[PDB]
Structure formats: structure tokens, C-alpha cells
Amino acid sequence: LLDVLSEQQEQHQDLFNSQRLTFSEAMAKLYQRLNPQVDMGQRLPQTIG
Amino acid sequence: LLDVLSEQQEQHQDLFNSQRLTFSEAMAKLYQRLNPQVDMGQRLPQTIG
């Protein structure tokens, strides 16, 4: 996730500019996209972010 | 919800008649349209229905 943030921020800006997603929710959803073995949404994306 | 089902679903067909979602999803979306304050455990509307 750190590597994606540092070098590939723009490549998922679609997720970040998503008005539906808060910054923590955007982070949580990105963490869901890459490394999908941690995929978890029953604990709210806001909290995981 | 039972009372609305008895007598007012005919105002809610818009939700019902939408190809976006299935019948159980329609029920879930109706119920959450009712009692809007009541959130759920961020689960699929399929399961809620």
C-alpha cells in the first residue's frame, strides 16, 4: 500500500476523487483493491482506513 | 413495513420495478427506505432481503 501511494497515487485517483468515499474510506477501498486477501468490509471501511 | 406492503407498495414500485436490483434487494432497499435511521452491519442487500 505504501509503494502504491508513493509511486502510483495518480493511477487510482479515480477512487480518491470519488465523492462517495471519504479519505479514510478511499484508503480502505484502495487497501481492498490491492492486496485483496485482506478484503474485509463488515468492519466499516471508515474504521479500517 | 408490513402495513406499507399491505397498502402503499404501489407508491414504491419505482424501487420495485428497477432492473438494477433483485426482489430481495428491493425488499431490503424498501425496508431501509423505511426506518431510515436504522443502519445495518454494512451487509449485502441480498442478505438483508
A25, A30, B15, B26 from A8: Cα distances, Å: 18, 11, 39, 39
Q: How far apart are CA B12 and CA A39, in angstroms?
A: 34
Q: What angle do CA B28, B32, B38 make, to 5 degrees?
A: 130
Q: How far apart are CA B35 and CA A39, in angstroms?
A: 29
Q: What torsion, rounded to 10 degrees, do the Cα atoms A8, A10, A12, A16 define?
A: 130
Pairs of CB atoms within 8 A across A/B:
5
Experiment type = cryo-EM
Chain A residue with the nearest C-alpha to that of B39? A44
> Considering only CA atoms, which of B47, B20, B19, B18 is closest in space to residue B31?
B47
Residues in A touching B42 (Cβ below 8 Å): 41-42, 44
**Phi-psi label, residue A35: left if phi above 0, alpha if psi -120 to 50, beta otherwise:** left
> Considering only CA atoms, which of B3, B11, B5, B47 is closest in space to residue B28?
B47
Helix ranges restricted to H, chain B: 2-7, 13-16, 23-33, 45-48
Cell 479514510 locates to: A24
